[PDB]
Every structure is written in C-alpha cells, then in structure tokens.
Design a binder for this molecule. Structure first.
Ligand SMILES: Cn1cc(-n2cnc3c(NCc4nc5cc(Cl)c(Cl)cc5[nH]4)nc(N4CCOCC4)nc32)cn1
Lengths: 330, 248, 826
C-alpha cells in the first residue's frame, strides 16, 4: 500500500497532454493519458515560481482536504507529478508540480448549456441523491466546497456523479469562527447570506447552490440570473421572499441588511411559480431554498426526503442523449 | 494508498545520518536542538501547538530519509515550520520566520542559512514535500489526551493535574524519536500512564469500567504494558540526562 | 477584437403560417402569409393575390391570428414572437401612405418555466374576450382583451395536465372554454376547462374527458352550427361534443400523417386536411337536423381531392381557391373543381411561388464561366426535393431542377463537367419482402445505374426483422450534368447505409479526379452507428466505377481535402488518410478528444472541428511529427450547426439557437493558455438556422477589385430558404456603421415596438447576451429607404474618428453613397 503512496517523485513525462478542457477554481484543467496505463486522467495545478510564499497555500488546502475524502461521489485525486528535476541541482530547480485527478466523461455545464441532454424525474433523482450523499460525507468531515457550479459537477455515461474542484474549499468549525470571503460562490448560485456580507457562514451555503441546480434541471434555465449582487438579491426576493426579520431573525445581524434592501417586501411565491415540479421535489426545493441558513435544510435531511429517501443507487439512470436528432431533428 | 511513517527502535541505527559517521549521541542531540528550534521560533511567532508539532513531525521524518551532514538542521527546521503553518492554517511569511530565527540563533548557527537565508529555506520546500510524500495531514497526541480525559469523571483538580502533567510530557516527547516509533494515540495514553504513576493516581477509578485495571484498553486497543513502559522510559531519560526533576 | 458584417441576400421563403380575414379594410378579404420574421399582406382577387404591404419584424413570428372585437371596424392582428414579444397591430392607410400601427406591446416571458414540447400555441376566444397562450408546461397564460390592456399584461392559471398536444377555444359555450388533448402515462385524452376572467382560475369543463388515440395531433374548433371539437390523429378522426361521440377511421389517412387543417365552410360542414405526402383531403360533416330545430352530426366523411405540395398551412380563399403554404417545397395556389379530370384529380395548380425550402448543402460554381458565379443548392425534401440554380441578374434569377427525393450534399467536379449529389428516397416494405417506392425520383430515372456489391458488413448472418408498411431510406449518389442537369447515373448504396459526406478531388500522386462518399450503417437499435465506409468512385465515360473502399467503425459525418490527403471525421475521431500508390487509403494520424466530430473546415495545415457540444476546436497537422495537435478551443459550450474559416485568426460558427458567433485567437501570447483560449469576439442572433457555410460570391465581377469597403465573402443557406452573406470590416468602418445603427434604431419605428438591440441579442434558453462584433447590414441598408427628415436626423452631429486623422463630421449625402456601395456586395 506504499507503491501508490510514493508521490511527487514521478514526472509528467509519463503523461501525454491531449489539451486543455476548461477553467477550474484557480487554474485551467488539462487532459492527458498515462503512457504506462493508457488511462485518461484530469490534470491541473499551479506554479512554484512566485517565491512570495513558495508553494501555494490554497493548493495545500486542496491537497489536504482531498486526500482525506474518499467516496463514490467524489473525484479521487490519483497522484501528484512534477516537471523534470535536475539531479544534484535541486537549488536551481524551478520546476512546477501537477495534480492528477480522475477523468470523467462529461461535465454537467456543457450538457445543459448546449441543451442536448434531457433529465427525467428518475434521472434527477439519481443525480440529486449521489450529489447529497457526497455532500453529506464532506459536510460530515466539516469541509465546505465554497464553489458549487455546473462545471465542477462531473458525470460518467454510466450515471455516476462526482464533485470536482476543491481548491476553494476550506475547513468548517462550529465552535471556532474564522472570517471568510463574503464573495465565494458564483453569483447565480450564491446563497443570500453571502450577498448580505456574512463572513462566517455555515455549510448550508452548498445546499443553496444545489437547490438552484435542482430547479435548473426542471426548467432547463438557471433560477437566479443577475450580473450584480443587489439584482441577484432582488430575484431571490421575488421567489423565496424578501429577507425579513420574520423569516430570518438574524437577518438584522448581517451587515448589508440595511444597505441592500429589495424594492418591496415581496412574499414567497416559490410553490406557485414551481407548480409544474413534482410534489416530492417541490417540497425539497422549498426547504433547500430557505432564506434563513439556520432554517435551511442540511445535506442529510435531503437524503431523508420523500424525493430521495427511496431512490436506489442500483437503478443509476444516465441522462438521455439524442441519437439521430443531432444530424437533423424528427 | 497511504505511506507508512513508523519504524522500529532498532532501525534508527541505520539512518542516513548514522551511516555517514555521525554517532548516535550526536544525532539525538541534533534532533533535540532542531525540535526546540522549531518549538522556540514558532512560540515566539504565537503559533498554535498543533502547528509546532506538525513541523517537528516533518523534521523527524525528514532526517529518516536524509543526513544531517548534507542538510543543515536549522535550515530544515525553519522550512518545516514554514510548511506546517500553511498546512494547519496558521500561515507566516518566510521573512518573518527568518527574522525570528536570527534573533534566537548566534552568528555561527544562523550561518547555515548562507548568504540568502530566505532562498536557502524556500528552495528546501520542494525537497521537503517530496520527502514527506505529500502526506500533510498529521495527528498529534494532544487531541487524544483531551479526548480521553473528557471521558474521565472524578476529582476535577486531580484530573486537571493529570492533563497538564501529561501535556508537559507530550511537549518533551517531541524532542525524541517517539513520534516516529509509535502512533499518537499510544503516546497520549503513555503520557497519561506516566503522569498516573508519578501522581499515584488510579485512573481506572475515573473510567466507566472502574475495575478494568487496564484502563487504557478502552481507549487504544492492543497496547501491552511493554510499549507504555518503553515510552515512559524514553521520556524520563530526557529529564534524567539534564538532571531536571519531574514537573509534579 | 473582430468586426464583421452580415446581410440578407435572399429573404426567407418558407411559409410558417397563413391566415384569412379582413385586416386592411372591413370589405377586403386578406391573406396574411407569415415567413420567418417577415409578414406578407395580400388581397384576394378573382385571378389571384394582389400584394399591398410587406413589413419586417424584429422577431420570429410564432403566433399570427386575426380577430375583431366589438367596436372595431376591421380585424386586428396579434403576433407573438419566439422571444415572447407580444403586440397587437392595426392597418391604417391614408391614401398612398400605408402604415401599420402598434396598438399594444409587451413581453410575456416568465422568469420561471419549462418550455413545452409542442411549441408556443396561440388561440383567441370567439367573442374576443382573451388571448390564450401556452408557453410553459403546467401553465396557461391568459391575456384579457380589455380596452385598457395596452401593456398586454397577463396572468398564469395553474394547469394540472403538464404535457399538452394542442388547444383551441371552443364554440357555443356560455363561458370561455378551452379544449385540449394532453398525454399522461395512460395514453392521450381530451379534456375541457372554463376560463374565468373574474375568478382568474379554471372551473370544471363543459363535457367530460374521453380516452383518445395515442397519436392525437390537432384540435379543430367546430363552429356554432355543430359545436364541439374534432380531434385529428394518425388513423382515426373523432368528434367530441357533450354526450355525442363520432369516430371515423378511413384507411387512406393511415398511409401518411396529417399535419394541417383549415375550415372551408363557415357553417362547419367542410374542412381541408393535408398529409406529409402532399395529398389534399376534404372532411365532410353531414348534417342531421332533428324535428326540434337542431342540427346534430349524422356522420363524418373523408374524400381525397388531389396532390399538393407538402404544406405547413392550408387556407381556403373564397370561390374554390386554396393557398398551399409549404415549408419543404414551393407554395402554391390551387383550384378545387367540382368535377374530376381524366386522371381523377379535383385539384389544378394556378400559380407556383418559389420556395428554396431547406437548403441542406450548397456550392458556388461559375458554370457559365462569367466570373460572376452561381449558387447550386440542395433544396426541398421528399417529393419537393430539388436543385436550385441561383444567379445575380434587379432580381435573382433562379432555375429549378426537380429531384422528387430528399437531397443531402452536393459537390462539383469540373473534370467531368458534372455535379455529385447525395440523395435519399422513401420506400415502403411491400408484400414481396423488398421495398416499393411511392413515386419515381431522380435516383430511379437515371440513364445508367449501379448498386454497391460490397461485402464488408455482410458479416451479419441474421438480417434484422422487417414488417410490412415500414418506411425505409434509400441513399444514392447522383451524377448530374452541369449543362442539362440530367441524371446521368445513380449509384444506390447498401441497405441501411446513409450517405453523409461527399467530396470531389485528386489525392496523392493519383491524377484521376474522384468522387468520394463517406457513409454509415444505420440500424434502429444503434446507440450511435458503429459501422461505415469511405468509398472512392471515379466517373469516367458515363459510368461510375468503384475504385476502393475503406471500412471505418462509425459514421463519416464529413470529409474534406487536405493537402492531397483525405481528412475524415468518424464519430468522435478525426482521421487523416493517405492515398497510397496502390489506390488504397492508409491512416496517418488521429484525434479523439471530441464527442461527435460533425463539421470540418481546413485552411493550410490548420483544421477547424465543429463538435456537437464542444463548439469549435483548432487542429494542427504539423508535417514534421505526423500527428495532430490541439491549438486552441472555444470553451463556451455551443450546439454547432455549421462552421467556417474566415481568416488565419478568425472563425465563424452557427448555433442551433439561431445564433452566429466568431472566435479568434487571443493574439496576446503571455501564458500558453491564453493562446489555447479561443475568445468569442462576435455574437449575433441571426434568427435563422444555418446549415452550410460557403466561401464565394454571386456578384458580377468585371475586373473590379478592392473597391469595396468590406473584405471577404461567405454565403450561407438556412432552413427557411434564407441566404445571407458574412464579411469582415475594418475598425474604422465598423465604428462608423455601428454608431449609425444606434442612430437608425432611435429613428426607425419597429413593428410592434420591438427593440432592435433585444432582437439581435444572443439568445439561448439559458443565456441572453447583447450583440457584439457584428453589423446588422439589413438595418444599415434601410437608411436608403427612410424619409429625408429622418436621414438628416441620423447624420446630424455624426463625426467619424477612423484614425490617422480627426473626427470629421458626416454629411447626409455622403452616407447615402456609402450604403449604395454596401448594397453592391449582394
Ligand atoms: C478540479 N478537477 C477537475 C476534474 N475533472 C475531471 N474530469 C473532468 C472533466 N471531464 C468532462 C469534460 N468536459 C469537457 C469539455 C471539453 Cl470542451 C473538453 Cl475538450 C473535454 C471535456 N471533458 N471536466 C472538467 N471540467 C473543467 C472545467 O470546465 C469544464 C469541465 N473537470 C474534470 C478533477 N478535478
């Protein structure tokens, strides 16, 4: 069990780089295949050239958090490789390192953004249950994936889902509060507490982002789409209700509460505007998109929901791909 | 999967330092010197105790793969503390650690850092990460000393005297190779075992099984008294060498 | 940044909808034909149609209905665009000045909603009390037709039935009632609801729900005399009204799917129907009046009238004439006779309106060597399939070459003075075990003919099961002369083999010019075809000769000539073949990081790959290493429909969402990743579905060179028959025309008060982005049509800062001359 443990000693020469596949949390993700095994792997890391702090601390966080987490719904970091290092000349060595991840077939963003894939109710059940099982595992280890986006949600053609980029992930502690960056999640998936300036936020920040993803699979359009933080809070208020001390006692505690007020004190119209969603999912959506993070559901409670409690991981339902409609419709 | 970070006492006679002509007494001194160097510098920087031990664990493991003659001790210890800060989320600038080191080191000892003290340390970070095989997560006997003491119920003053005395023994065991010989759970039990003998406390009475005279077994399984006596013998050897007496 | 310029060379010709009413005046009978973003207004005469007005709208016309509320002299027009722009229009003519007034305007898009499968549906209450819109699943939007609703505000009523097929407003109901066919897991049913403007909710419908055919298609609102509704399906036609239930299932309508309907008699006795094979039917409603004064339905009858063009919309004009609005073929005016001719047909064609239909592929070729160039398109589908010869001559001259089968791809071979055309025809499983074609076509009427005797896939011992009556596609390679356009030869490919790509070129050291076809073995079970062939033909002395075949494990979606080597895309793989001295293909290098390599374009050693969802990728052959290498890729996900190379740094693409975009190399080589990042520098909502990009120009060139402000010429054909041109601009010319557009938009009044910037904005279901890097040439060329006071208002204070000088002020006449030069590029 130590052959696979020896890291940093292998070179990137064993991987042939196919090309770049996208932009990750801090750096761009590239694709490669191992010469020895022939396996497709996902590559991505940073550079050691900035001697201000040497090895990046945000990268050290992603290495520490990911090596502790092992789950069927989490991308497993395979190994870590380096550039060609000079013998005996380790002082002049300016070579960088590379993180080796497991490569998945597709990405949820590209599938939805193109509009080709279709999600049935059973497909969404297979999607959300795997998403919450991994999220509950990492939340159980007191870690927060502060960057839940469609580009970081990966799926294989079998139907298995995995989360990807943990570079923006930090550790959570209920006792010791550490101030964090108020802006951390993509504006379309950002929880309302971060819009209002919460620096010490709860693990419920990921539940809100996945809630916007749950509704996005039924409408094929993102729920809240705005270019500014205040405009984002307005769209959230028109659907989930305006932030008010009635539904959110500590909303006054948040700094930007008096600063960022919506136009009116809108009422919650979530169940009305989502009447086409099944009742099992609509109740889940209502709890996941709760304004107050203390009243917002947890990752385990979503797995004990009428929509996901009885879902079987054996019936892994892959998303429907068109066949001859890609050349000309029917 | 994960690398093994534990050797036997008999294996310490074959470290890269030993095979280059260094005698066993000198390497043990170089380890105690380097450990307090990481300890004293990080203490001046106001670092958490887990950060100090993390650099010390990196330090002990590093010279199982390398020789003290080829790598300066204080340059390596500074690099360990610098990396340990970013690992345990208590980061410090490299210039701030070098400044603290020069204050507490004489001209000769700081001469190991060469003409550029920062660069000689920053360069060693690559070799440190490769040597530790990128196994950054490190556990320490502190959390187990507290996790086991919380399950003890009885005289609050007697239990607290046990904790502080055992906690003192944990700080002293960092100066030794015990960190490499045994897991942190056994060390946390051994320091409870040592502080129990010195204070003449019968810890089993404070446990949920008051007649289970081998109280530690409900904490850490498969630990013979031979291991606890071996650890206790090594910890008290530090006090007997320097002639200092038990804290008590 | 990149700068481009797009103009429409041929407006959309496919008819998307047609209605009859009294819109221009209360006396005239008008026929409003709706093409994509275009509205044509005609007046019915005894000889035909008289055009009166044609207006353009900044949106794709989705719903178009004429209605007359109480207190209006003549009918008003309601139009809803694809981007949910709603408006109510009125015709006003003061002598010779004809203008269309925007009575109401608004955007009915909902923030949240799943777009329905059967598309946007628009119906109006018979009493003109409300406008019914079906935009999202489980939601029914109601626009109350009140005098004060000039903003067209609307509310949504919750709908239990999520999957609706079609809906109409019923006749003869006390309260406004809708009738719709919905589909649940228990099949399809028809249900009714009553709309209440006062309660703003649904009440229980008049008549109960019935279990109907699983393939129920359309709902027909039978007028007051009979009442109720008629449900059209694939095999049965059913009438539902209260307890009365009637169902006819004639055997003739089972042969072809019915697609359109129209009412002939206002009393509701006769209805028109049309199928996919062009047949025109008449639905007769026999009346049984009961000694109580009431007119119940005796029976239903269907009679075949004749054959028309495959029509998207039918509309009956008075005195027995019917307008056949076709999307797949030429639109027609047909006369319905009471007596059948000697052939048994009651239909006789009056006029033929040319429709380029679906332009699947096209090539620019100077057939007559006039330096001008002609555009030869594969146009039409099924019986309406044809070739079109287009030339600039001031109106386009178009010659039609009917094929009577579906054309696929075309290529020109000057060495043989002929074209290569891939085509497909529809045959039906007969009783002999084989297949029998419905009609003769170009593949059957060839002078000489041949069939592939290949044994590559003859490894299947058990041939797949065939039942009688199932349609099959038969693919052929047509050799058509360039002068007579006579089908000289037709090569029929293997059974279940689809022709997808076609190229004509020489390869390697082989001097013979070859026809090369990339095919695919298509079976219904296939989870993407896994068999295919690359076949090389040589047309010599009137006979097509099979030169060589190469077996591939997938579909050859596209091929192209590369430096004397054959570049072919097979499923996710992009392969480069070498033509050996033994006249056989040999693989050199491959690239695999694709999903479905569809469209390929080459220029030098660079290769542009158009993926199903990865957008565009740049590939380099690199002759030294002998392997492909990724250069740069567009990381914004897009569903590509056609790609094209503009220059060595700019690339042009087309999306399935009717959007054009332009990628370019970042042109700043800091990090190697910036180079690898193709930056989308142009965005533009075209409104049309581009199928084929083609370099070239149809303008007459009499040695004139560089006299144009524009550089380059790219032609493209669309599904609606629209043909356009894309060209690049300098930064000086771009800012001049772009600043002019903003001045023209504030000046020009749009139909329905639609913002031009909103119309040209990049638009998918998920993203809405403003247009950039593109100059709407149709808006710039409209400067030569606005009145003189509007011209000077646009040129007032307009200073051009082209550079290498100072912001000189523009004159009104100086801008008129510039646009006249821009009108010469098409
Ligand atoms: C941090 N981390 C990432 C991974 N990781 C593993 N596997 C993939 C993966 N595989 C599907 C996939 N999508 C593709 C799109 C294109 Cl255009 C191309 Cl050419 C190839 C593609 N492959 N995608 C991505 N994304 C990165 C950023 O933007 C989009 C997706 N991350 C991946 C593991 N850890």
């Amino acid at each position: 069990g130590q052959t696979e443990s020896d890291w940093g000693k292998r070179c990137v020469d064993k991987f042939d780089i196919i090309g770049i596949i996208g932009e990750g949390t801090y750096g761009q993700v590239y694709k490669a295949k191992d010469k020895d095994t022939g396996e497709l792997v996902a590559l991505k890391k940073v550079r050691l050239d900035n001697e201000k702090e040497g090895f990046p601390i945000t990268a050290i966080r992603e290495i520490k958090i990911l090596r502790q987490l092992i789950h069927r719904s989490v991308v497993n970091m395979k190994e870590i490789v380096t550039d060609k290092q000079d013998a005996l000349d380790f002082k002049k060595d300016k070579g960088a390192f590379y993180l080796v991840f497991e490569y998945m077939d597709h990405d949820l963003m590209g599938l939805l953004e193109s509009g080709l894939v279709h999600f049935s109710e059973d497909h969404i059940k297979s999607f959300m249950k795997q998403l919450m099982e991994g999220l509950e595992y990492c939340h159980k280890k007191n870690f927060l994936h502060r960057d839940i986006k469609c580009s970081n949600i990966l799926l294989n053609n079998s139907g298995q889902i995995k989360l990807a980029d943990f570079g923006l992930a930090r550790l959570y502690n209920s006792e010791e509060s550490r101030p964090y960056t108020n802006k951390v999640i993509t504006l379309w998936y950002r929880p309302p507490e971060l819009l209002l300036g919460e620096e010490r936020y709860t693990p419920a920040i990921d539940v809100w982002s996945c809630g916007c993803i749950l509704g996005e699979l039924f409408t094929k359009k993102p729920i809240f789409q705005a270019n500014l933080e205040l405009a984002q809070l307005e769209l959230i208020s028109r659907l989930c209700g305006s932030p008010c001390p009635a539904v959110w006692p500590d909303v006054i505690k948040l700094p930007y509460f008096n600063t960022m007020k919506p136009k009116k004190q809108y009422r919650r119209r979530l169940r009305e505007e989502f009447s086409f969603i099944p009742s099992a999912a609509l109740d889940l959506l209502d709890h996941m998109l709760t304004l107050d993070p203390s009243k917002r559901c947890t990752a385990e409670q979503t797995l004990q929901s009428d929509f996901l409690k009885d879902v079987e991981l054996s019936k892994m339902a892959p998303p429907d791909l068109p066949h001859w409609q890609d050349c000309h419709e029917l | 999967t994960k690398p093994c970070w534990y050797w036997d006492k008999k294996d310490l006679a074959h470290t890269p330092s030993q095979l280059e002509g260094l005698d066993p007494a000198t390497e043990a001194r170089y380890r105690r010197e380097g450990a307090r160097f990481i300890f004293d510098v990080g203490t001046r920087l106001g670092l958490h105790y887990d950060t100090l031990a993390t650099g010390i664990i990196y330090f002990h493991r590093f010279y199982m793969f390398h020789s003290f003659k080829q790598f300066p001790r204080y340059v390596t210890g500074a690099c360990c503390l610098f990396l340990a800060g970013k690992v345990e989320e208590t980061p410090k600038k490299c210039k701030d650690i070098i400044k603290t080191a020069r204050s507490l080191l004489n001209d000769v000892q700081f001469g190991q850092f060469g003409d550029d003290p920062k660069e000689e340390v920053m360069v060693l970070e690559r070799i440190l990460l490769q040597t530790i095989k990128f196994d950054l997560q490190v556990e320490h006997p502190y959390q187990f000393l507290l996790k086991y003491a919380k399950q003890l119920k009885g005289d609050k003053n007697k239990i607290q005297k046990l904790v502080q005395m055992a906690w003192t023994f944990v700080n002293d065991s960092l100066c030794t190779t015990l960190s490499l010989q045994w897991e942190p759970e056994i060390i946390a039990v051994a320091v409870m075992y040592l502080a129990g003998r010195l204070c003449k406390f019968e810890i089993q009475e404070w446990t949920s099984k008051p007649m289970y005279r081998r109280w530690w077994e409900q904490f850490v399984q498969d630990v013979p008294v031979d291991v606890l006596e071996d650890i206790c013998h090594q910890i008290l050897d530090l006090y007997s060498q320097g002639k200092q007496q038990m804290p008590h | 940044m990149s700068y481009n310029y797009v103009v429409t060379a041929q407006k959309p010709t496919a008819v998307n909808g047609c209605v009859t009413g009294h819109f221009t005046s209360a006396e005239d009978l008008n026929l409003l034909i709706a093409k994509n973003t275009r509205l044509e207004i005609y007046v019915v005469t005894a000889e035909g149609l008289r055009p009166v007005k044609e207006v353009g709208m900044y949106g794709k016309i989705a719903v178009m209905e004429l209605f007359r509320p109480k207190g209006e002299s003549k009918d008003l027009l309601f139009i809803l665009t694809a981007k949910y722009n709603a408006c109510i229009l009125e015709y006003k003519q003061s002598g010779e000045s004809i203008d269309i007034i925007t009575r109401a305007h608004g955007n009915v898009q909902d923030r949240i909603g799943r777009p329905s499968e059967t598309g946007i549906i628009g119906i109006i209450d018979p009493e003109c009390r409300m406008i019914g819109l079906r935009l999202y699943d489980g939601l029914f939007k109601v626009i109350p037709l009140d005098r004060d609703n000039k903003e067209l505000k609307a509310f949504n009523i919750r709908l239990e039935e999520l999957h609706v097929i079609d809906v109409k407003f019923l006749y003869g109901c006390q309260a406004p009632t809708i009738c719709f066919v919905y589909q649940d897991p228990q099949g399809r049913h028809v249900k009714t609801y009553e709309v209440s403007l006062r309660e703003k909710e649904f009440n229980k419908g008049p008549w109960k729900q019935e279990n109907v055919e699983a393939e129920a298609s359309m709902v027909i609102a039978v007028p007051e005399p009979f009442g109720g509704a008629i449900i059209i399906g694939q095999e049965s036609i059913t009438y539902h009204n209260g307890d009365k239930y009637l169902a006819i299932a004639p055997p003739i309508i089972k042969q072809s799917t019915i697609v359109c309907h129209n009412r002939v008699d206002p009393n509701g006795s006769r209805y028109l129907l049309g199928d996919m094979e062009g047949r025109l039917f008449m639905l007769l409603l026999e009346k049984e009046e009961q000694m109580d004064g009431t007119v119940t339905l005796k029976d239903l009858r269907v009679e075949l009238l004749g054959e028309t063009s495959i029509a998207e919309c039918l509309t009956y004009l008075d005195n027995g004439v019917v307008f056949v609005g076709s999307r797949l073929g030429d639109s027609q005016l047909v006369k319905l006779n009471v007596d059948s001719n000697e052939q048994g047909s009651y239909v006789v064609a009056m006029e033929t309106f040319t429709n380029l239909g679906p332009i699947v592929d096209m090539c620019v070729v100077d057939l007559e060597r006039q330096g001008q160039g002609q555009l030869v398109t594969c146009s039409g589908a099924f019986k309406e399939g044809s070739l079109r010869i287009i030339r600039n001559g001031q109106k386009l001259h178009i010659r039609t070459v009917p094929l009577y089968e579906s054309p696929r791809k075309i290529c020109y071979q000057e060495v043989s003075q002929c074209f290569g055309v891939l085509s497909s025809r529809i045959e039906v499983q007969d009783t002999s075990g084989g297949t029998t074609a419905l009609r003769p076509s170009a593949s059957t009427q060839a002078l000489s003919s041949s069939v592939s005797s290949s044994k590559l896939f003859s490894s299947s011992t058990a041939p797949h099961e065939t039942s009688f009556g199932e349609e099959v596609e038969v693919h052929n390679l047509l050799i058509i002369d360039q002068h007579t356009f006579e089908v000289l030869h037709a090569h029929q490919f293997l059974q279940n083999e689809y022709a997808l790509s076609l190229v004509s070129c020489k390869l390697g050291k082989d001097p013979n010019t070859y026809f090369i076809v990339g095919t695919a073995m298509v079976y219904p079970e296939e989870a993407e075809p896994k068999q295919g062939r690359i076949v090389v033909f040589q047309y010599s002395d009137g006979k097509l000769q099979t030169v060589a075949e190469k077996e591939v494990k997938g579909a050859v979606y596209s091929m192209v000539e590369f430096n004397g080597k054959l570049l072919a895309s097979i499923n996710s793989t992009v392969r480069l073949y070498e033509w050996t001295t033994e006249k056989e293909l040999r693989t050199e290098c491959n690239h695999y990081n694709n999903i479905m390599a569809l469209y390929l374009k080459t220029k030098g050693d660079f290769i542009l790959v158009g993926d199903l969802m990865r957008s565009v990728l740049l590939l380099a052959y690199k002759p030294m290493e002998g392997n492909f290498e990724e250069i740069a890729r567009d990381f914004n996900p897009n569903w590509m429909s056609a790609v094209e190379i503009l220059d060595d740094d700019n690339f042009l693409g087309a999306e399935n969402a009717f959007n054009l975009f332009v990628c370019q190399k970042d042109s700043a080589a800091t990090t190697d990743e910036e180079r690898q990042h193709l930056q989308e520098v142009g965005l533009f909502h075209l409104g049309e579905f581009v199928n084929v990009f083609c370099h070239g120009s149809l303008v007459m060139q009499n040695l004139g060179e560089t006299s144009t402000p524009t550089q380059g010429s790219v032609l493209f054909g669309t599904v609606n028959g629209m043909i356009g041109l894309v060209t690049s601009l300098s930064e000086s010319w771009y800012n001049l025309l772009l600043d002019m557009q903003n001045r023209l938009n504030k000046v020009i009044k749009s139909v329905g008060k639609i913002e031009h910037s909103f119309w040209r904005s990049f638009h998918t279901e998920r993203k809405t982005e403003p247009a950039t890097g593109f100059i709407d040439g149709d808006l710039i060329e409209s400067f030569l049509d606005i009145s003189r006071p509007k011209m000077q208002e646009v040129v007032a204070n307009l200073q051009y800062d082209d550079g290498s000088g100072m912001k000189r002020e523009a004159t009104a006449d100086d801008l008129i001359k510039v646009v006249e030069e821009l009108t010469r590029i098409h």
